[PDB]
Design an enzyme around this catalytic site. Structure first.
Site, mmCIF file in Angstrom:
data_model
loop_
_atom_site.group_PDB
_atom_site.id
_atom_site.type_symbol
_atom_site.label_atom_id
_atom_site.label_comp_id
_atom_site.label_asym_id
_atom_site.label_seq_id
_atom_site.Cartn_x
_atom_site.Cartn_y
_atom_site.Cartn_z
ATOM 1 N N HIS C 111 0.787 -1.242 0.000
ATOM 2 C CA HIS C 111 0.000 0.000 0.000
ATOM 3 C C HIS C 111 0.817 1.289 0.000
ATOM 4 C CE1 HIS C 111 -2.164 -3.340 1.913
ATOM 5 N NE2 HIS C 111 -3.247 -2.909 1.290
ATOM 6 N N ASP C 213 37.980 -28.595 16.904
ATOM 7 C CA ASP C 213 38.426 -29.823 16.212
ATOM 8 C C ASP C 213 39.554 -29.632 15.196
ATOM 9 O OD1 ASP C 213 38.533 -32.343 14.720
ATOM 10 O OD2 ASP C 213 36.556 -32.788 15.281
ATOM 11 N N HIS C 216 40.349 -33.827 13.143
ATOM 12 C CA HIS C 216 39.795 -34.243 11.824
ATOM 13 C C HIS C 216 40.701 -34.002 10.622
ATOM 14 C CE1 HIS C 216 38.669 -30.053 11.081
ATOM 15 N NE2 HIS C 216 38.271 -30.380 9.865
ATOM 16 N N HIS C 221 40.995 -34.344 5.793
ATOM 17 C CA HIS C 221 41.822 -33.589 4.876
ATOM 18 C C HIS C 221 43.104 -34.299 4.444
ATOM 19 C CE1 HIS C 221 38.831 -30.647 5.431
ATOM 20 N NE2 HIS C 221 39.146 -30.390 6.687
ATOM 21 N N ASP C 372 34.533 -31.426 4.408
ATOM 22 C CA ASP C 372 33.825 -31.092 5.642
ATOM 23 C C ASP C 372 32.323 -31.182 5.423
ATOM 24 O OD1 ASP C 372 35.962 -30.505 7.568
ATOM 25 O OD2 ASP C 372 36.470 -28.788 6.364
#
Ligand code: FES
Ligand code: FES
Ligand code: FES
Ligand SMILES: [Fe+3]
Ligand SMILES: [Fe+3]
Ligand SMILES: [Fe+3]
Lengths: 167, 441, 441, 167, 441, 167
Positions: C111, C213, C216, C221, C372
């Protein structure tokens, strides 16, 4: 090696074929196949990259010859083929067409990417099948007949409720 | 806990199934039903996973399911069948992201915890530097399937550590499974892998169909009747037997009419017939002798089709066996897993012929099953309506008429025709009892 | 209200996290967990929205989120930072449907109510003809973010008007944020815009990974270790510190081993090193001096990576900074927003080099981050199983071994290695406290 | 202006390139690229029609040269590229091929529509990426090498979980 | 049952709607709202299904909905209008999978139970062999719509067997419906079929817009004002009336200003004018005479547009009538079914002209409606936010100013302008009353 | 019968047209249409296979001529076309191109498969329309103009929220 006028004719042949299928002209389509037809849709399973193949041996989603493909069409010509009556709306998008010479003169190895779109009824959902078709086409008169097709889908678990449509 | 509405519906249904012979329609497609069922059925019942012939060598594995839970089913380096939850004990990663394969070890991609196909955690990177050698590996083996067992090559699992044994759960059904599973010395083999695909229908509709429904043939498979592939006699299932057992299990057996000679034992090859005559009891042999079709369901969601059928409209029929899972994905969705099986020592000509007879009739592109799939998705869709769900399903076939067959030589509750809905009622009665079980059984 | 099941699970979890050092698996992928968490975490915690360098000019805005709530974050015509709910006060239409831009006013397409970028309703069509001048415009300004604040260029918002101040919420974490955010006089700039894409994983798995972390790296990796881009030493994280703070926050800092000289201060350009030696405290300076990697999470869902990495397998490493949101979309779905930042006054050669080092390693196409992502989606899928959900996550790294570092010169609870899971435990402990809070805090 | 035999060759080259990618033949694909390769996937944001551009300056989803593209392929040749081992099933549908002359002789500007289909594992879901690729192809012997590609996707928020696949 | 939160929200809303003139924003896009609404609104109210002109011949049918429930709406072989649940009484299959057509019987594909279009079960395969003639067919007819009725060609259904009659439910609205529906002897005809498409918006937004909103024209349809297709006077709606009735129903009626002569009766063809002057009362005639636009909603989700509009920027306007369903698919989704209607005896030249005026302005590709759809999807998205949902919708247009029109000659509560939000308030009031009804009405 | 150089020209014309639409170059696209343009998008309903047609008579999703198509473009050139401001990201995938001779010399019947991909804003969703376009193209100077298009979608219930895009 090479083709040219032949590439055009084969490409137009693929588009005409797809048109017949998308029009539900199954009887006419059946006239495009060869007496020694082999029509197969293999099963795939997810495997590590090391695997030589992820195609299942000895079992298939579909493995038709001229007689079973006739049965398939005859079924759709009854008044009772409920899977396709009412008919699906479908579209065979045929792209990346590659043409190569076959094992005999008068034969051609034809490879195309297919995306098949499918809806049914009035529900707001749709299915997509994606895959590669590897065909053998044979010269017949001034056109071609299909002697062989392998439809390898980019799926393991298939994402439509039946394979009632010819790909 | 059950909603009061669902509880009351199930209670009413448990009364209606043997008086009115009806079942509430609300059971087919409902999010609460599906959530309760996941725990009460699929967290307690025995569920088919794999056939032993899929994992014949040490190290062979397939990945299979009880609802959303994923399990590695493998033959380990000692020759034992295992079922491991496919979730690393460290942070829950899948230790196997293939559908099948062969390996001596499962190595987690996240941090490299390494498991034997035995399930034992055998390797932890930085066991010294990070864990100071304090981590007790034997406390963090892959989590076993709480109950795992086999009957005649069929591997089942249950999520309930306190389940009845598989053999008690199958009970009298074992007599009939033998007829299909135990005919040959070398046993059955799954050829290749199952066809897997998604139907937008509730899983129960497939189970309901195979447990007792020959009636649907005349209309659902009318196209096939016209092509000469389905039986043309509208009375065909009168020449048969409708059988059910405890734990929801049921089957039907149909043979040819008196004025139709068909080869005995579904025309199985001679060497297989030799073996079955010696492997099965005389009572099993005589039940099998005039068989043309066997259909059944092992509660909850494993169905069996052993059918004599043409591979096209011009061919003489050959026998084929299929097992299928109606795998639950949601109130309105399932994944069919359809397996083709044949006796290992069948001649190669028969294996190929049987395969084709199966392939053009059943499975994802089969001329029969594709219409079955269309029926089940249609039911499911309309049965999601709130008004549709206040209605009932009619299982009245035989009401006022069915009398047990005094002359049947097999175990179970048997009727001397296969136009009946007693099997479907028995299946849904056990289903409802499990749904209402506040404590197991 | 919590279901009795969820409540008991969280209560049990709150005990296990510091005794067994485990956490219930049911927290990863569950519709009820997601729904409760939306209110109890995202309706109370401070959530990162934008960097000030994204909206440097008056009129500049970006559209950002707290869960499904959409906010305009802008610099207004008076130079003030605002956060406005992107919902017209009349019928709730978005007054800005672009993701970013510059405007002095937001005009609602429905409006035409017109708002200053200040948030003030300044124009109503038919104010006389339709409203008879009875509409009090100042009662219908765009709804402000209940709590909005900045720390060193980072704009956060909270849905809770009674939240502790941003500075109290960050607490001891501020000491470490300075090391990443406050090195230069001109400050950090976000370059361009964030990469935004959808991962079918729960957001907490990204937060868990970056809070603590390093472990990992060796497996996740491994490809990058083989290419020479990740640290080849399996003991690399022993040459680091694992630190946590109140409010669920934590980080790790890793440097090179004694027999590896690397440029001080991550090899940052000389002008930036000049400035950081003057901007940071001697204690901050000495912690930063030998850094190669910093990774952390600002609870709940903002993570930081400040890493020294090659832009390909043939190149010497350069430092890059990335901030990322793990934006919650559902129990099993998130949208990553990954920002690359660099000091405004770094030489252009360094900006380009640092950008390429970030781009080929992290983000949507990065050789690290793509794996990941695969790991988190895998965990999420298998963690939707009802049996999977009855298990535990193992956070036992260091149990019976970890002792706080008495020689650490920074604040927080610190351990003299970065192979530990104390940070993840602290994050989940705070998450569980918030989940159980019937009244805030 | 104009081409013809060249259009055919370029079109065939594009379909061969897509085929290699869909077969996971990354090492072979790497041989199709030029020493000064630039391969970029820009970020887009929603903007009013009035905006001169909606393409982000200074930041990108991917911005590769020959050395970084090599790294990408070397990574996929390890036993540890978890994002693509097991491999995705993908299909590059390449359509609407437009060929124009380049800035040098022996260079061509090649623009195609790409729909990329993707499944992983046995979960019943799939991703679709749609976009336009603008390439510079260079003649090399009797074929072509790719010197440049920009993939502009019809998305702002990307609707797949990583860009692990070459487009 | 309602959650306490939803209950308290509705109770507060019921007070706010007539004091503050606001309504809780939580009602637009919320899963509990939708689920309660399905039962409390769509399980009780009268819902439009079809126009009688769509099924003019015996055997004609269309398939239509009340939420997820699917009904066959047909003219049976005796000429009676029926509404049948489209779910076989056996196992619930759809007995019609087409959207429309003509048949004397519905035959279920699953087992072949065969129903007259009357609804009667007239044939069961194996009536004797399977059922032993014990199945009482008259107990298993297709389930009727519990309440079915027509007003001037419009077929409505209610799921509540104890609903008030359609005539009482429409109440005073009938006076105005006549003006749009009953102008001609032969009646109205739906041309062809509805346009059906999915908008990601809540259904109530469309209903809200048509029940009383002319205000939005100035901004939403500013493009059309510039092209000369929408009224250029910003005061255009001051020359009109805002009217509402019991049961949530409302409409607006707008005519030209004093210094603008337009053909009387929307410039309808002469023969239709003749008939209307004799079919409608003088009071209805004189209200219709200077009309240019009529817009309104029949609670819940049927809207009406009778508008005078150009088929392009170069053409004189012609009148068109459209009826549309806002069909609820989910909290954040709907299906529009947009019908074009024209008097059966209108000359063909007018039928074509009217069709084009409708098609280029409204419907799926219309230059007005396409912007309407964009506004509704935008509101819906941002109103899914938990914080957005704690706000209010502003319905204060006229507060402190509106006085009922003492000179209005029609029934209902009428105001002497069409810039007002009383109709919307009346719509939401009734909606809130139904949502709170523990027992119907 | 036959074409060849013409097939190329028409195919290139279709790709040029699609490109304009996907770039939002509506004013330029409007120049490609003929003074007697007919542009229509019919409604379909699910029917049994036996039905002669499933296309609705007398009612349409869109039925434009040159004047109404001009209006459509003029709307999009205001500052207030909210449905397309911000603009959708779209892609017209045009495949299976078939060219035949028309009813007059200088006219061609052109049939192509269309898959239209559409996203809006930053929400992680997308729409697909699939369909067949049947066109009449007329020679004009050294190029073509569109005199007629029918877009027949493979849907009954349309699966996007408006037809604000030209197909
Ligand atoms: S999740 Fe498997 S090793 Fe960490
Ligand atoms: S909704 Fe914004 S002006 Fe009405
Ligand atoms: S479900 Fe209709 S006849 Fe059985
Ligand atoms: Fe069947
Ligand atoms: Fe990582
Ligand atoms: Fe409007």
């Amino acid at each position: 090696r090479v083709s040219d006028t032949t590439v055009r004719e084969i490409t137009e042949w693929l588009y005409m074929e797809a048109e017949l299928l998308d029009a539900g002209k199954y009887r006419e389509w059946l006239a495009l196949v060869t007496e020694d037809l082999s029509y197969v849709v293999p099963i795939r399973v997810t495997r590590e990259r090391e695997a030589v193949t992820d195609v299942v041996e000895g079992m298939t989603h579909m493995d038709d010859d001229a007689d079973s493909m006739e049965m398939r069409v005859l079924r759709l010509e009854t008044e009772y083929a409920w899977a396709e009556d009412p008919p699906s709306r479908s579209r065979h998008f045929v792209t990346n067409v590659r043409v190569a010479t076959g094992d005999s003169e008068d034969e051609f190895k034809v490879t195309s990417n297919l995306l098949l779109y499918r809806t049914r009824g009035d529900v707001a959902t749709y299915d997509v099948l994606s895959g590669e078709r590897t065909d053998v086409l044979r010269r017949a008169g001034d056109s071609f007949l299909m002697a062989k097709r392998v439809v390898l889908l980019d799926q393991t678990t298939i994402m439509t409720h039946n394979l009632a449509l010819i790909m | 806990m059950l909603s009061n509405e669902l509880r009351q519906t199930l209670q009413k249904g448990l009364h209606d199934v043997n008086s009115d012979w009806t079942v509430p329609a609300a059971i087919i497609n409902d999010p609460e039903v599906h959530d309760v069922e996941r725990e009460r059925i699929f967290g307690h019942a025995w569920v088919f996973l794999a056939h032993e012939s899929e994992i014949p060598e040490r190290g062979d594995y397939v990945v299979r399911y009880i609802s959303e839970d994923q399990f590695i089913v493998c033959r380990d380096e000692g020759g034992e069948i295992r079922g491991h939850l496919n979730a690393c004990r460290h942070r829950g990663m899948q230790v196997c992201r293939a559908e099948m394969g062969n390996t001596s070890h499962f190595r987690c991609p996240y941090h490299g915890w390494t498991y034997s196909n035995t399930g034992s955690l055998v390797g932890v990177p930085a066991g010294k530097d990070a864990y100071g050698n304090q981590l007790k590996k034997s406390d963090w083996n892959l989590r076993p399937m709480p109950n795992l067992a086999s009957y005649k090559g069929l591997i089942f699992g249950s999520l309930d550590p306190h389940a009845d044994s598989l053999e008690d759960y199958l009970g009298d059904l074992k007599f009939y499974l033998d007829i299909v599973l135990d005919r040959s010395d070398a046993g059955l083999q799954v050829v290749g892998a199952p066809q897997r695909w998604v139907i937008d229908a509730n899983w129960k509709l497939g189970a309901d169909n195979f447990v007792g429904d020959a009636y649907h043939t005349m209309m659902t498979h009318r196209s096939m009747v016209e092509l000469g592939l389905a039986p043309p006699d509208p009375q065909f299932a009168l020449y048969g037997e409708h059988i059910h057992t405890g734990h929801g299990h049921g089957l039907g057996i149909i043979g040819p009419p008196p004025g139709m000679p068909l080869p005995e034992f579904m025309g199985l090859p001679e060497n297989i017939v030799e073996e079955l005559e010696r492997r099965l009891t005389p009572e099993q042999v005589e039940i099998f002798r005039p068989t043309a079709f066997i259909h059944g369901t092992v509660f909850p969601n494993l169905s069996i089709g052993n059918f004599l059928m043409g591979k096209d409209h011009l061919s003489a029929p050959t026998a084929f066996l299929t097992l299928r899972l109606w795998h639950p994905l949601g109130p309105d969705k399932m994944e069919v897993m359809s397996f083709f099986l044949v006796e290992k020592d069948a001649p190669d000509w028969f294996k190929d012929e049987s395969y084709k007879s199966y392939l053009r009739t059943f499975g994802i592109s089969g001329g029969f099953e594709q219409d079955d799939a269309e029926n089940w998705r249609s039911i499911t869709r309309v049965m999601g309506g709130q008004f549709a769900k206040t209605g009932e399903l009619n299982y009245q076939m035989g009401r006022g008429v069915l009398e047990p067959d005094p002359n049947w030589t097999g175990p179970g509750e048997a009727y001397p025709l296969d136009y009946a809905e007693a099997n479907q009622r028995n299946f849904l009665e056990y289903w409802m009892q499990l749904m209402l079980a506040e404590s197991p059984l």
